[PDB]
Design a protein around this ligand. Structure first.
Ligand code: TGL
Ligand code: HEA
Ligand code: HEA
Ligand code: PEK
Ligand code: DMU
Lengths: 79, 43, 49, 46, 105, 144, 259, 227, 98, 73, 84, 514, 58
């Protein structure tokens, strides 16, 4: 419920030309949430908004490289 | 500003030469490289 | 005694101008330099598809 | 005690105008020429 | 800084100094040509008299030339100035640049 | 009378509008008759001739104001020499073209430009002022 | 012949040999970085050492032995030193900027935090702190040196100098040992990069500074200094203090705050 | 795109760009004012025999030549800044597109719903269809819906490049590890061109941008077809 | 002992430094380190300008605060005057080296 | 014949500048004003005029039939 | 604080020497002490092949091109891991 | 004798002479480089057929014009010649270090040429931004060579700055205060200050670029959490001041020339000229990010930098106006130098005016990295800095040498140059407005006409350079010896005759306190 | 040590026409020539390297 999704909205935590942290935060936020909702089980569609936002905003090569590194055990972000 | 007359006058003929030589020293070697540009390309 | 410019000024001004105008105009219009002027009021468009 | 006066405070001679001419012409000419020859040099590295 | 009439009288006083010397003469004229003005006849008259005391004709004439020069494109100034100095010129035997032929190239 | 390079720290003669009375006289040494003339100067200037008055002026000054301000014909020479070397430059460009530049791309051929102009008008390049605004679509020709 | 008080300097080969040695060093570095050879470098280094030796020897000859250093001359030297120091400040600034630029906006590739993920900083209360005391102490003893010299006491001057020099050396050894012991390197990202380059150049200056001190020691042994004219010494002290203060700033920025 | 013998800016295709045109007219008007003025006075100073060569008082006139420029500067900055805060102002965009620089081409990602991406390469001159533009054409154009706000995110996978579309008033550097945002809106349908604007190597001159501006309807069908 | 061992300038100063030092003790300025003080610079009271040759360059700052200095050669002989302000200067010979 | 009237002899140079400064300001202004009427205002009108009639859908459609698009035939 | 002690009416080298021996050197001896009893085992950190560390974009131009100047086998792993 | 005099010199005049010689020569190289640029652009298509080489030629052109022609001529050349002469100094503060300042140049220059000879040269632009400038995109020695060249050029100017400041503060007569010193002397001092503060920042940055290339640091490398934007900060932190360094000694000489040939004893508003130079110096350090309006800084930072940049027009305005005011009422001598000076005042104003247009971050979005920039800066460098060089060289030539130039020839020279530079750079404004990128080896066909006219003007300028050489030869060949110079009472540097003896001011000037 | 400054003062003020960098005697000379030799040696060497490095080695 509430998605109705077109593209990521304006987000006053990231108000400037530089949008790097926005992609990054959302990647983090997506995966933290996924963590929580799996060391409990069931649905992750609570986290789904985060997936949609960073999907829209991160370049693919960034997302895949990060994805690799999570699997690799070399991802430098606290999840 | 004032000056003595030339110690060693450079006549019109002499100027003509000085001038012609100066130009050629600039033009020839570049004209050369430029003219052969093509003999350098496709490699 | 009249100076270099009293004697030659008028010849130098005259041939200088002449030689200059001639050769530029020659150069501008006669050796195939492409200027690519605005086609407007110059070129008749043609079907490209 | 160095030489002082016009034509004496420069590291080159102006005693002969024709020698002066050859000198200047090598000097300025070498400078102008070089980028033409560097470009050449680079095209022939190929 | 002072008025016109003060300035004029000051320069007249300057050129009237009975034992003015050559250096002082040149200094006065060289300074005077610095200003945005053509100097009043009263001053010129003073300065030429000074030439007479220093026994120096050529400078009197050179003074006339600068008067004309400082007028630039105002051709009316110089003939006025001569008109006014005419008794001093006649009294002292001073010829004008034009009278001497020094105005032609 | 002769000026020497080593007199540089001694006062000099100059002819300048704005320095009408220079620091030394033009002629410094007098011949016999010239002394006699400077003697006459100590007398009434009425007594002097016009020739004599010119002389005294010449001993004092090199050039008269009229002389020192004469115009000249130099500008002619300058303008004409400039145009000459400018005309001369065109020779280099003529050379360059002939011996150095190769054929320009086929997109300059006339057929190419005509078709390309058309496409430009189809896609309505600068329709407000620059390019397309100058074409009459209804009459299918350039606006007069 | 002169009635001003300034020094007209004998023609000298050393500008030219310095310039050449600059060519050799940069050539050599290039050679080393790209062709694995060190010969040119060695040459450049030698000739540079030789130029420095002779040029400063002649400065000494000109002043201690020939008396060209009039007060006017000395006033000039006071300015040149100060300026040279100013330029060294701006240089280090560039590295401080780099540190602060990175550590304030930590990128995602570092895990978005400072210090980065995987980096374990040295503890600023351990050797960094001792280092800090060793330089601050030398600041004191050098000042004791200076007062001794001015009051004309040879013995104590020498004693104070020696102590300042020993402290400098100490610093240098602790610092080498820290380098060996550190669990991160220069190739460890922008952390290692900023850390090793800033402390590096600083370490280089502590050396240069120490060298300058030893030179003054020897000139002092040899009675070159009067109780009133000893510019070689004042220069070395200013430089020393500069070295000191840069250290403080590194310690506050990199070791402490950036830990 | 530019046409032969052009003098000023390409026609505006967006609001912001139209706004800059008028701003530039403002500024250029002031430029002519000042330089004609300087020209006139220079020649006023040089065309009289009259002299005044003794010393002159600074005070009075130095004021005029300080206060005037300051006024003029304020007349320039005022509108300049307005426009700058405007090129920034709170957007509400309907779409996000990423562009990524590469030596030497651009790739584009449209990842709001599907995972669509493609490479845009210059058409070689030997392969131009007649009517086509030398060094400006691309095999794959950037199809966007006209008349809507779009977020363009720009970055690079290698060196610096710069993504520009002059007639839209767009220019944003492409910096590796960095995501720069710009905002795009066309008033018209059409084809609008730009070129890499940061030296990125030996083929700098050859990695153009071509946007194809069309109605939502077409844009959707097109994107489904590019999956 | 907290004795000496450091030489003093008086003992150890040499060449020109030493000249400047001694000279100063007798209040003399042979190496032109201090600014001379104008007199009234009239004909009776000229500015006296020491020199080892027959000419020296004077600079005359005609009035305090002038941005422009007037430069000229002063020659041995009768006093000369600043071509700008009129003040008098006279050359006086050697006596920094008779 | 008859005497010449005494003319103006002071501040000729300044007289000349008073006069011409005014010239210089006007000339300078004119130029600016010219650019503003002949270019700037013209430009606002061009834009204004153009969009008033404009129909983006008809624009598009014309472009479509002329075959310019990859996405729309 | 802008003191804790005091001086100015008599002095010189003597005062500064008092500070060398009285405060400066003793602080060093303290900091040295503090360090004697903090040395030893830095628990060698576990190795993770993080991509932002152990950077190699060019071989170093000494050794085997892969060791850093002050390499320490005990604490400085290579890009492939610590050493044998 | 030759070696002692010319390789071991400690004499300010001779050394200044060596700079004039070194600078002219580099000038010939820069010119050639510019003509290559314009040959390539002169018709559509490709001439060199290699764009890495185009990029190299462009990069070398800028390094050569800036570090090897302007700075040595203006600072090293006229600065050494004229500064001591204008203050009554017997030489510079540090004569020997002075000589090393010069000798570091030819080796520096040698390295620059080498960089273009090995591998594929350094085709990076003179800004040398990474990653393009880094060890992947520019692998091998070329970039490293370039860095070292800047290192030696940097040290040169650093030691020089120190020497100029010391000499200017410490070696004036005791009676003369800084407020009695010629404006050229101020202009050098202020410039020396900017050199001192800015070069070491450059030096630090390129040092970081070196280590990222050769020691596996990651200062500018996102992979290691570094940032390329950081490099632009440092470069431009040095870079904007750099531009003011290039023009200030020019302002200084224009002031002397305009006064001299106006028959004036001093410039209008001396203290306002001082003020104006200092303000430019100061402001010149707080505006660097306007070289970065397109990198994605925030809007507020951008609004600050537009605003601070604009402010420079004010103290610059005062100078322009004071020059005009100095002409007012002058006895004008139409000398060749005077003609350079007039041209400068006008052309520089135009260049400065297009700078103002650029200062607006709003417009610069569309103007950054186009020919509009190139147009702007060649107006301020090639008709700014250069015109002052030509002006100063024809004015002081007889003093350096003892001989006179032929005035008619010099006037013919000026005329030709005037036409060439305008025809070169004027059309390039249209190229920028219509949006042609900077640094391109070819261009879409629309842009042809302007580029053609541009390249055409560039040849006309070449004809001037060629005539200039002949003009210098004619003077040394004919040997017209100077006798009298006007206006020495306010132009101290002429007082020792032409050329002045090896040692001047052995007995210093006499100046009263009062 | 002992104070020998006066002695060195005498030697270096000795009116022999030599420049300061040669007034030490024979040692100065040796040292000077060595330096000069390495500088010109080194430069020649580098020209050679520059040259050699300017051509590709395949
Ligand atoms: C510095 C000297 C220059 C000389 C150089 C020689 C080389 C040859 C160039 C010979 C050129 C002669 C100079 C005329 C100036 C024209 C300005 C202009 O067209 O401006 C318009 C805009 C274009 O904007 C538009 O989009 C509207 C276009 C107008 C509609 C009609 C379009 C059809 C063409 C109409 C023809 C108009 C005339 C232009 C025709 C094109 C000319 C090539 O371009 C721009 O911004 C251009 C950027 C220039 C900014 C620098 C300012 C310099 C100040 C000079 C002092 C003035 C005192 C005169 C004092 C007079 C002194 C002579
Ligand atoms: C001599 C060198 C020089 C000088 C003096 C200047 C002077 C100025 N420049 Fe320029 N410039 C360069 C050389 C120089 N420039 C170079 C080489 C580059 C390119 C670097 C690169 O990318 O390669 C560059 C780039 C550059 C940019 C970057 C644009 C971009 O890259 O995208 C900007 C913008 O802010 C700028 C602005 C200015 C300004 C405001 C001045 C001002 O100082 C000008 C001040 C003067 C005046 C304004 C005229 C006189 C004043 C009056 C008559 C008073 C009245 C005026 C008004 C009321 C406005 N210049
Ligand atoms: C001092 C600085 C300077 C000077 C003088 C010039 C002079 C010229 N420049 Fe300049 N140019 C730059 C600085 C300069 N340039 C810089 C910084 C760049 C940026 C590069 C980059 O992107 O990295 C650049 C870029 C640049 C481009 C950019 C091209 C591109 O982006 O691809 C072009 C193209 O036309 C160009 C052309 C010319 C021309 C034709 C001349 C000249 O030929 C103009 C005529 C002037 C002369 C020919 C000089 C004469 C002077 C002497 C001969 C000295 C002698 C003195 C004595 C004997 C006393 N330059
Ligand atoms: C105790 C401090 C003394 C250190 C100095 C001693 C070594 C010789 C170098 C002298 C140059 C001085 C320092 C400047 C260069 C940077 C070195 C940084 C300091 C340092 O030495 O960092 C070390 C790396 O050393 C390395 O690469 C060493 C590689 C050395 C190569 C130097 C390359 C030359 C670059 C300098 C030229 C730049 C120009 C400078 C001035 C120009 C301005 C005009 C750290 O070792 P590590 O194994 O990574 O980590 C520890 C792991 N346990
Ligand atoms: C930006 C710089 C501008 C440069 C402008 C150059 C102006 C022209 C100068 C003369 O250059 C010469 O021209 C000849 C061409 O006419 C060339 O000879 C070539 O052609 C001749 C006749 O066609 C043959 O005799 C020769 O063998 C053949 O080498 C010759 O090498 C070249 O140096």
């Amino acid at each position: 419920k509430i998605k109705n999704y077109q593209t990521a909205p304006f987000d006053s935590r990231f108000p400037n030309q530089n949008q790097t942290r926005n992609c990054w935060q959302n990647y983090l936020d997506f995966h933290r949430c996924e963590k929580a909702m799996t060391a409990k089980g069931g649905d992750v569609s609570v986290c789904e908004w985060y997936r949609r936002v960073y999907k829209s905003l991160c370049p693919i090569s960034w997302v895949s490289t990060w994805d690799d590194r999570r699997a690799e055990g070399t991802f430098p972000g606290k999840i | 500003i004032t000056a003595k007359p030339a110690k060693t006058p450079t006549s019109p003929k002499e100027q003509a030469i000085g001038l012609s030589v100066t130009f050629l020293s600039f033009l020839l070697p570049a004209g050369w490289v430029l003219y052969h540009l093509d003999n350098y390309k496709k490699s | 005694a009249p100076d270099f410019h009293d004697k030659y000024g008028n010849a130098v001004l005259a041939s200088g101008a002449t030689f200059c105008v001639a050769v530029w105009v020659y150069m501008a219009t006669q050796i195939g330099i492409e200027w690519n002027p605005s086609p407007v009021g110059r070129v008749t468009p043609k079907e490209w598809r | 005690h160095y030489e002082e006066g016009p034509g004496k405070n420069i590291p080159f001679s102006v005693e002969n105008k024709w020698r002066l001419l050859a000198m200047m012409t090598l000097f300025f000419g070498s400078g102008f020429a070089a980028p033409f020859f560097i470009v050449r040099h680079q095209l022939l590295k190929k | 800084h002072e008025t016109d009439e003060e300035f004029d009288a000051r320069w007249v006083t300057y050129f009237n100094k009975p034992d003015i010397d050559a250096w002082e003469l040149r200094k006065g004229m060289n300074t005077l040509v610095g200003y945005d003005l053509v100097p009043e006849p009263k001053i010129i008259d003073a300065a030429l008299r000074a030439c007479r005391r220093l026994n120096d004709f050529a400078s009197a004439v050179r003074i006339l030339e600068v008067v004309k020069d400082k007028a630039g494109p105002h051709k009316e100034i110089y003939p006025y100035v001569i008109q006014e100095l005419r008794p001093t010129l006649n009294e002292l035997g001073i010829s004008t640049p034009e009278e001497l032929g020094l105005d032609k190239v | 009378s002769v000026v020497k390079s080593e007199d540089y720290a001694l006062p000099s003669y100059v002819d300048r509008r704005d320095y009408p009375l220079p620091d030394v006289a033009h002629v410094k040494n007098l011949s016999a008759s010239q002394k006699a003339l400077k003697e006459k100067e100590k007398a009434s200037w009425s007594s002097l001739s016009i020739d004599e008055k010119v002389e005294l002026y010449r001993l004092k000054f090199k050039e008269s104001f009229a002389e020192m301000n004469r115009s000249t014909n130099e500008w002619k020479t300058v303008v004409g020499a400039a145009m000459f070397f400018i005309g001369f430059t065109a020779l280099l460009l003529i050379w360059e073209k002939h011996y150095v530049y190769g054929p320009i791309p086929h997109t300059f051929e006339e057929e190419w430009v005509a078709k390309q102009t058309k496409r430009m008008l189809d896609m309505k390049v600068a329709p407000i002022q620059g390019f397309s605004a100058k074409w009459d679509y209804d009459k299918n020709e350039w606006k007069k | 012949h002169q009635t001003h008080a300034y020094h007209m300097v004998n023609p000298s080969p050393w500008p030219l040999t310095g310039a050449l040695s600059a060519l050799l060093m940069t050539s050599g570095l290039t050679m080393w970085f790209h062709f694995n050879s060190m010969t040119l470098l060695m040459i450049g280094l030698t000739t540079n050492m030789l130029t420095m030796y002779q040029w400063w020897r002649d400065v000494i000859r000109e002043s201690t032995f020939q008396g060209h250093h009039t007060p006017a001359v000395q006033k000039g030297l006071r300015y040149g030193m100060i300026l040279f120091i100013i330029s060294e400040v701006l240089f280090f600034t560039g590295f401080f900027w780099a540190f602060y630029h990175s550590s304030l906006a930590p990128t995602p590739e570092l895990g978005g935090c400072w210090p980065p993920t995987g980096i374990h900083p040295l503890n600023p209360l351990e050797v960094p702190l001792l280092n800090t005391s060793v330089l601050l102490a030398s600041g004191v003893s050098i000042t004791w040196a200076h007062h001794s010299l001015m009051e004309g006491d040879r013995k104590h001057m020498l004693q104070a100098l020696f102590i300042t020099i020993t402290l400098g050396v100490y610093f240098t050894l602790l610092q080498a040992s820290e380098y060996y012991e550190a669990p991160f390197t220069i190739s460890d990202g922008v952390y290692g990069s900023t850390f090793f380059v800033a402390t590096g150049f600083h370490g280089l200056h502590v050396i240069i500074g120490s060298t300058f001190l030893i030179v003054c020691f020897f000139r002092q042994l040899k009675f070159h200094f009067t109780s009133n004219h000893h510019f070689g010494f004042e220069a070395a002290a200013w430089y020393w203090h500069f070295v000191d203060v840069v250290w403080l700033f590194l310690y506050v920025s990199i070791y402490w705050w950036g830990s | 795109m530019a046409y032969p013998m052009q003098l000023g800016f390409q026609d505006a295709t967006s609001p912001i760009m139209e706004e800059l045109l008028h701003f530039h007219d403002h500024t250029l008007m002031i430029v002519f004012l000042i330089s004609s003025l300087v020209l006139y006075i220079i020649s006023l100073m040089l065309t009289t025999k009259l002299t005044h060569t003794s010393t002159m008082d600074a005070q009075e006139v130095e004021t005029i030549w300080t206060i005037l420029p300051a006024i003029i500067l304020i007349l320039i900055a005022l509108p300049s800044l307005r426009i700058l805060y405007m090129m920034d102002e709170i957007n509400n965009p309907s779409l996000t597109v990423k562009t990524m620089g590469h030596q030497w081409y651009w790739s584009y990602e449209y990842t709001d719903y599907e995972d669509l991406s493609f490479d845009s390469y210059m058409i070689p001159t030997s392969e131009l269809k007649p009517g086509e533009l030398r060094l400006l054409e691309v095999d794959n154009r950037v199809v966007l819906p006209m008349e809507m706000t779009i977020r363009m995110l720009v970055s690079s996978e290698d060196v610096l490049h710069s993504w520009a579309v002059p007639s839209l008033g767009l220019k944003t550097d492409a910096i590796p590890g960095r995501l720069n945002q710009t905002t795009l809106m066309s008033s018209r349908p059409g084809l609008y061109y730009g070129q890499c604007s940061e030296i990125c190597g030996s083929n700098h001159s050859f990695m153009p941008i071509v946007l194809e501006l069309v109605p939502l309807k077409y844009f959707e069908k097109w994107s489904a077809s590019m999956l | 002992a907290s004795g000496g061992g450091v030489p003093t300038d008086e003992e150890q100063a040499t060449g020109l430094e030493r000249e400047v030092m001694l000279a100063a003790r007798k209040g003399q300025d042979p190496y032109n380190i201090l600014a001379p003080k104008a007199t009234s610079g009239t004909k009776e009271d000229p500015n006296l300008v020491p020199s080892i040759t027959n000419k020296r360059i004077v600079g005359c700052i005609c009035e305090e605060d002038n941005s422009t200095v007037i430069w000229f050669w002063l020659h041995k002989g009768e006093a000369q005057r600043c071509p700008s302000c009129g003040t008098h200067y006279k050359l006086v010979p050697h006596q920094l080296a008779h | 014949s008859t005497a010449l009237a005494k003319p103006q002899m002071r501040g000729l140079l300044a007289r000349r500048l008073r006069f011409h400064i005014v010239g210089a300001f006007m000339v300078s202004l004119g130029f600016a004003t010219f650019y503003k009427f002949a270019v700037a205002e013209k430009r606002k009108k061009a834009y204004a005029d153009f969009y008033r009639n404009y129909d983006s859908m008809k624009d598009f459609e014309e472009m479509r039939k002329a075959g310019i698009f990859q996405s729309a035939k | 604080a802008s003191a804790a002690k005091g001086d100015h009416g008599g002095t010189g080298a003597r005062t500064w020497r008092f500070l060398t021996f009285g405060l400066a050197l003793p602080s060093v001896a303290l900091c040295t002490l503090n360090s004697w009893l903090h040395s030893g085992h830095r628990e060698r950190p576990a190795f993770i092949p993080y991509h932002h560390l152990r950077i190699r974009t060019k071989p170093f131009s000494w050794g085997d091109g892969n060791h850093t100047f002050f390499h320490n086998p005990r604490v400085n792993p290579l890009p492939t891991g610590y050493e044998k | 004798m030759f070696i002692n005099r010319w390789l071991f010199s400690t004499n300010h005049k001779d050394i200044g002479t060596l700079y004039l010689l070194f600078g002219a020569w580099a000038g010939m190289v820069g010119t050639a480089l510019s003509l290559l640029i314009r040959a390539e652009l002169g018709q559509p298509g490709t001439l060199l057929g290699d764009d890495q080489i185009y990029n190299v030629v462009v990069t070398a052109h800028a390094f050569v014009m800036i570090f090897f022609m302007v700075m040595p001529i203006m600072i090293g050349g006229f600065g050494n010649w004229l500064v001591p002469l204008m203050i009554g100094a017997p030489d510079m503060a540090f004569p020997r270090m002075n000589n090393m300042s010069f000798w570091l140049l030819p080796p520096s220059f040698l390295l620059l040429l080498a960089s273009s000879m090995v591998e594929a040269g350094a085709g990076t632009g003179w800004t040398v931004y990474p990653p393009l400038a880094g060890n992947l995109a520019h692998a091998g020695a070329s970039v490293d060579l370039t860095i070292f060249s800047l290192h030696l050029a940097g040290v040169s100017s650093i030691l020089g700055a120190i020497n100029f400041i010391t000499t200017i503060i410490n070696m004036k007569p005791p009676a003369m205060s800084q407020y009695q010193t010629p404006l050229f002397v101020w202009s050098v001092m202020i410039t020396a200050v900017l050199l001192l503060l800015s070069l070491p920042v450059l030096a630090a940055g390129i040092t970081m670029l070196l280590t990222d290339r050769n020691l596996n640091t990651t200062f500018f490398d996102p992979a290691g959490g570094g940032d390329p934007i950081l490099y632009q900060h440092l470069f431009w932190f040095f870079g904007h001041p750099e531009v003011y360094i290039l023009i200030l000694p020019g302002f200084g000489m224009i002031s002397h020339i305009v006064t001299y040939y106006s028959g004036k004893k001093e410039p209008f508003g001396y203290m306002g000229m001082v003020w104006a130079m200092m303000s430019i110096g100061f402001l010149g350090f707080i505006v660097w990010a306007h070289h970065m309006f397109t990198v994605g800084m925030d809007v507020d930072t951008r609004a600050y930098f537009t605003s601070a940049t604009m402010i420079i027009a004010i103290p610059t305005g005062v100078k322009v106006f004071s020059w005009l005011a100095t002409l007012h009422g002058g006895n004008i001598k139409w000398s060749p130098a005077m003609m350079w000076a007039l041209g400068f005042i006008f052309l520089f104003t135009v260049g400065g005016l297009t700078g103002i247009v650029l200062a607006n971050s709003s417009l610069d979005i569309v103007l950054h990295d186009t020919y509009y920039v190139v147009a702007h800066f060649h107006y301020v460098l090639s008709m700014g800095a250069v015109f002052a060089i030509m002006g100063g060289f024809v004015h002081w030539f007889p003093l350096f040498s003892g001989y006179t130039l032929n005035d008619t020839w010099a006037k013919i020279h000026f005329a030709i140059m005037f036409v060439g530079v305008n025809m070169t750079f004027f059309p390039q404004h249209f190229l920028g407005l219509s949006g042609m990128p900077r640094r391109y080896s070819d261009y879409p066909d629309a842009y042809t006409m302007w580029n053609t006219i541009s390249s055409m003007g560039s040849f006309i300028s070449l004809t001037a350079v060629m005539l200039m050489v002949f003009i210098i030869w004619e003077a040394f060949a004919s040997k017209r010896e100077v006798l009298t110079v006007d206006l020495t009472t306010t132009n101290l540097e002429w007082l020792n005759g032409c050329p002045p003896p090896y040692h001047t001011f052995e007995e210093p000037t006499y100046v009263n306190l009062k | 040590f002992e104070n020998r400054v006066a002695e060195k003062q005498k030697l270096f003020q000795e009116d022999n026409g030599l420049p300061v960098h040669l007034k030490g005697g024979a040692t100065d000379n040796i040292l000077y020539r060595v330096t000069m030799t390495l500088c010109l040696g080194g430069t020649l060497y580098s020209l050679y390297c520059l040259g050699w490095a300017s051509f590709p080695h395949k």
